[PDB]
Amino acid sequence: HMEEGIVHKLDVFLIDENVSIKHVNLFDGDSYGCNIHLKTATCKYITFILVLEPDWENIVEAKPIHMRLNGKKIRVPLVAKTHTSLIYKVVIYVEEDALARFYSDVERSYTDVYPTFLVNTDTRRYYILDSGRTYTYIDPFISDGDKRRWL
Numbered sequence: 001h002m003e004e005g006i007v008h009k010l011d012v013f014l015i016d017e018n019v020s021i022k023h024v025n026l027f028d029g030d031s032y033g034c035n036i037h038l039k040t041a042t043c044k045y046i047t048f049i050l051v052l053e054p055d056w057e058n059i060v061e062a063k064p065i066h067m068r069l070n071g072k073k074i075r076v077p078l079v080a081k082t083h084t085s086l087i088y089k090v091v092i093y094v095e096e097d098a099l100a101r102f103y104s105d106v107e108r109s110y111t112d113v114y115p116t117f118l119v120n121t122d123t124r125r126y127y128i129l130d131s132g133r134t135y136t137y138i139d140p141f142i143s144d145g146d147k148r149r150w151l
């Protein structure tokens with residue numbers, strides 16, 4: 001792919017599952033998003049906190065983050081701002097297994113290189129099905145340091 005010279009930073013945290021999906025961002029490209037296969041046997045609320053750090057020096061403006069849960073559009077509130085970070089928080093309600101798609105763009109040239117994860121909200125075990133055009137990794141915890149990034 002042709003280098004864009006744009007490198008955003010993006011971490012995604014599943015609060016109640018205590019899971020850190022870190023460095024979800026493409027290591028090159030003005031786009032962000034991911035796919036999260038959520039598996040559950042019980043009815044629960046799943047809280048996502050997304051900490052976005054746009055590459056301001058190389059963009060005119062930061063695109064919004066959108067989301068679809070099982071095809072249905074879900075509002076992704078930008079609830080807080082720091083001097084460098086945009087902090088999104090979304091809460092979904094699921095009764096069975098669900099797929100959550102975060103995205104900034106519709107074009108496949110971007111969405112096809114989003115990383116894809118599986119998260120079992122009952123066993124809290126995970127799996128990186130596809131890293132895409134990223135260096136993403138999953139920590140089975142949420143550090144206090146990461147928490148203070150939005151607290």
